[PDB]
PDB file of C-alpha atoms in Angstrom:
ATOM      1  CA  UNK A   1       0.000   0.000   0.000  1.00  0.00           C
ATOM      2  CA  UNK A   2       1.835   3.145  -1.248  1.00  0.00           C
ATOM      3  CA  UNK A   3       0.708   6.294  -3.336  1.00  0.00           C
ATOM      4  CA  UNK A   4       2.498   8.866  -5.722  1.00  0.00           C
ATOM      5  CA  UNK A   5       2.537  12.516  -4.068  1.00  0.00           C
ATOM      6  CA  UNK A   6       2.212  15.078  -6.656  1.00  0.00           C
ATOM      7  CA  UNK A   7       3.892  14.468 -10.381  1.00  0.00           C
ATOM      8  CA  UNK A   8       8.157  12.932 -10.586  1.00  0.00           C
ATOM      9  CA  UNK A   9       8.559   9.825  -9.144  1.00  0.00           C
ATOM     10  CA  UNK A  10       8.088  10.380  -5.641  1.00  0.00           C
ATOM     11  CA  UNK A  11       5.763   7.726  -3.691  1.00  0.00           C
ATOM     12  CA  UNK A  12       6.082   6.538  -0.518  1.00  0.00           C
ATOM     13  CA  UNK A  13       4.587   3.488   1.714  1.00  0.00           C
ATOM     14  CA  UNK A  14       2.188   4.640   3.416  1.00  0.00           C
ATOM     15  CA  UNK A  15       1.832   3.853   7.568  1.00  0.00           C
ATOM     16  CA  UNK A  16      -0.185   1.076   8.802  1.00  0.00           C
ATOM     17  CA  UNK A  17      -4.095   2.701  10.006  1.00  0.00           C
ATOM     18  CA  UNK A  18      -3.505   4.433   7.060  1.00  0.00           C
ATOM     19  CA  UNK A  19      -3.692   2.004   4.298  1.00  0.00           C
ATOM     20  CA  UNK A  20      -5.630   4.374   2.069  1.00  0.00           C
ATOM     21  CA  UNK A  21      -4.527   8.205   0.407  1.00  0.00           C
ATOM     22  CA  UNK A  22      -5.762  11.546  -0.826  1.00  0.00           C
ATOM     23  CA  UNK A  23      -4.885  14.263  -3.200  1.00  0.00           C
ATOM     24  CA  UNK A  24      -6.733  17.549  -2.262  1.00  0.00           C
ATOM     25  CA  UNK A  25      -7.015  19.588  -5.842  1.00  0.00           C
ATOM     26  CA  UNK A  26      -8.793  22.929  -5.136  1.00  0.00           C
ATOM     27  CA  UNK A  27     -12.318  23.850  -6.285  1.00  0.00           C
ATOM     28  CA  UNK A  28     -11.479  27.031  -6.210  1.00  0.00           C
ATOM     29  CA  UNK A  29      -9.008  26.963  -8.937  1.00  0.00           C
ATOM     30  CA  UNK A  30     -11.011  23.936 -11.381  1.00  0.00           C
ATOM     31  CA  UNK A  31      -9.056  21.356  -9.426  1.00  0.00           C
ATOM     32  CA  UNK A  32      -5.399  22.921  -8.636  1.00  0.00           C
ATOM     33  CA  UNK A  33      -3.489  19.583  -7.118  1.00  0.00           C
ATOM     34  CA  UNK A  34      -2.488  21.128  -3.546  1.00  0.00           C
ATOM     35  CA  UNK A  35      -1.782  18.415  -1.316  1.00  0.00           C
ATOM     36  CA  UNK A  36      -1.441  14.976  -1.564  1.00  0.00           C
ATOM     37  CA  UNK A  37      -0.193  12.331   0.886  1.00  0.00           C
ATOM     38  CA  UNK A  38      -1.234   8.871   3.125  1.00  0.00           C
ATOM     39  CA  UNK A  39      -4.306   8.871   5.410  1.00  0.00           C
ATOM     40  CA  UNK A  40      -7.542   6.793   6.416  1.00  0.00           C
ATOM     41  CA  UNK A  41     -10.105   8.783   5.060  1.00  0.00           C
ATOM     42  CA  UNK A  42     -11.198  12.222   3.631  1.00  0.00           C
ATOM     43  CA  UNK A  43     -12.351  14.751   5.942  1.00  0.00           C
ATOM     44  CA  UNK A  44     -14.693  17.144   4.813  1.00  0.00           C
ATOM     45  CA  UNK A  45     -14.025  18.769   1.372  1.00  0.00           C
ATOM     46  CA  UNK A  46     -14.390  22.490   1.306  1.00  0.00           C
ATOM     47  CA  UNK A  47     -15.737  24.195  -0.918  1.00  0.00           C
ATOM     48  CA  UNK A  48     -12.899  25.921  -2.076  1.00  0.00           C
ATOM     49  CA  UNK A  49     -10.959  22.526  -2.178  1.00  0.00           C
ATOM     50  CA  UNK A  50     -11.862  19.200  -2.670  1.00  0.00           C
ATOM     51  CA  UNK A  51      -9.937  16.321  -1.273  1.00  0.00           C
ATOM     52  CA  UNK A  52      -9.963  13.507  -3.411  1.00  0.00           C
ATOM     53  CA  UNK A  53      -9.227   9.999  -1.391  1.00  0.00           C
ATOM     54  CA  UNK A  54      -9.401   6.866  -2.697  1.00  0.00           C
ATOM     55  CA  UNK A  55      -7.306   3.179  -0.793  1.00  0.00           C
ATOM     56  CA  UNK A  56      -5.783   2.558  -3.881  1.00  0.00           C
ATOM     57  CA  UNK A  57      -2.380   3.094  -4.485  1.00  0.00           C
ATOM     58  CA  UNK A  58      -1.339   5.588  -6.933  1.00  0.00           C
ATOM     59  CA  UNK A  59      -4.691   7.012  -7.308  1.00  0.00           C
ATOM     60  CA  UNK A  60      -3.265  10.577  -6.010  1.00  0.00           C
TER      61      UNK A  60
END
């Protein structure tokens, strides 16, 4: 279980509990890639960014 930060190669393993990851692209811009990194699950998206977590690896 690992996932790809933003765009080079640059993944990491992610820590057990958190077997899942996110990439939080902002609304506010159409979907400007912010953040991105290894979690559980996605805490509520704001309006002016939305976090987009998925469990699969890579998916960010």
């Amino acid at each position: 279980l690992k996932c790809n930060q933003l765009i080079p190669p640059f993944w990491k393993t992610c820590p057990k509990g958190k077997n899942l990851c996110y990439k939080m692209t902002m609304r506010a811009a159409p979907m400007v890639p912010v953040k991105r990194g290894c979690i559980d699950v996605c805490p509520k998206s704001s309006l002016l960014i939305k976090y987009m977590c998925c469990n699969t690896d890579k998916c960010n």
